[PDB]
């Protein structure tokens with residue numbers, strides 16, 4: 668069951684973003700990310716259950732005093748959207764003096780990021796668990812290019828990624844989810860294809876040239892996102908497999924993961 672942590676053992680340092688999420692040190696020294704909220708019990712049991720190398724580690728709860736706390740591992744390099752944007756074509760301009768080898772991520776690194784998000788989605792699909800909000804803003808980066816699926820639904824600095832209908836991430840959603848709120852492992856695989864597009868554009872917002880209502884019309888009409896400049900044709904063919912109009916015609920996350928792993932392996936020594 669759910670592991671409990673004594674409040675005395677949690678020493679807050681500062682805030683990370685907004686429910687408030689803080690950086691802290693935990694005893695039994697160790698860095699951690701702590702979630703404090705102003706449904707908790709259901710989530711605690713769920714997060715104790717979801718255990719995988721590519722799912723952010725949950726350590727337990729603090730159910731003594733106010734607020735109630737949720738303890739997670741600290742992911743140094745932050746959210747995957749910010750990481751992509753800061754390790755993109757303009758990385759040299761954006762980098763601080765001390766930054767190590769500033770520049771855009773190469774093909775091998777982009778494929779290793781994509782494969783780790785896919786591995787996490789393979790685990791969730793095997794458990795018949797539907798994420799509903801897969802996007803780079805919901806993935807986290809740790810030291811050594813370790814990528815894990817974080818939040819399950821964001822940090823408010825990404826409010827522009829949601830449309831009010833109850834906030835929906837319409838740009839990552841297939842037509843059946845936009846029209847009927849039909850969420851399945853097949854709508855998550857569509858969102859995965861959009862994550863691939865975000866990765867290969869270094870964090871651009873999908874349909875950035877369009878407003879929310881223009882994006883809804885394009886998606887429901889069957890328009891597909893253009894191939895990114897850094898995207899090889901074989902990676903775009905994977906995106907297209909995720910974007911089949913009929914949910915049952917979409918490739919399974921398992922085959923997508925196997926294809927990305929096969930492409931990563933063939934590029935390792937080059």
Ligand SMILES: CSc1sc(-c2cc[nH]n2)c2c1C(=O)N[C@@H](c1ccccc1)C2
Pocket residue numbers: 683684685688700723739740741742743744745746807817818821822823
């Ligand atoms: C190094 S920066 C960082 S590490 C980190 C985290 C979370 C679990 N481990 N590590 C978070 C953040 C951040 O930029 N935003 C925080 C957030 C706030 C509200 C909602 C969703 C996300 C989460």
Ligand SMILES: [Cl-]
Pocket residue numbers: 903904907
């Ligand atoms: Cl193709």
